[PDB]
Design a protein around this ligand. Structure first.
Ligand code: FES
Length: 98
């Protein structure tokens, strides 16, 4: 399947829509589709690529940085996240973490 992924940058007031394959990470699809997003490690072990779910689900089983509570709050590491439904997510949420 292929899911619609809506990227929202609150500080910039932008809204971009991308199509992501069930077996591709969100960040990868975003770049291919022309949207550069923040990143560093690309391996699920930092917070640079952090985003926050507005709606929808992801499988980020490969991440390791976020604790359970943060996940509960809706945070996602875009670099290692696969969409598991259509999703609406806020990007550039790195600073929200502590
Ligand atoms: S860039 Fe480091 S966890 Fe995604």
């Amino acid at each position: 399947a292929t899911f619609k992924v809506t990227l929202i940058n609150e500080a910039e007031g932008t809204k971009h829509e991308i199509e992501v394959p069930d077996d591709e990470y969100i960040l990868d699809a975003a770049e291919e589709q022309g949207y550069d997003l923040p990143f560093s490690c690309r391996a699920g072990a930092c917070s640079t690529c952090a985003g926050k779910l507005v709606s929808g689900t992801v499988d980020q089983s490969d991440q390791s940085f976020l604790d359970d509570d943060q996940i509960e709050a809706g945070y996602v590491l875009t670099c290692v996240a696969y969409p598991t439904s259509d999703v609406v997510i806020q990007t550039h949420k790195k600073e929200d973490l502590y």
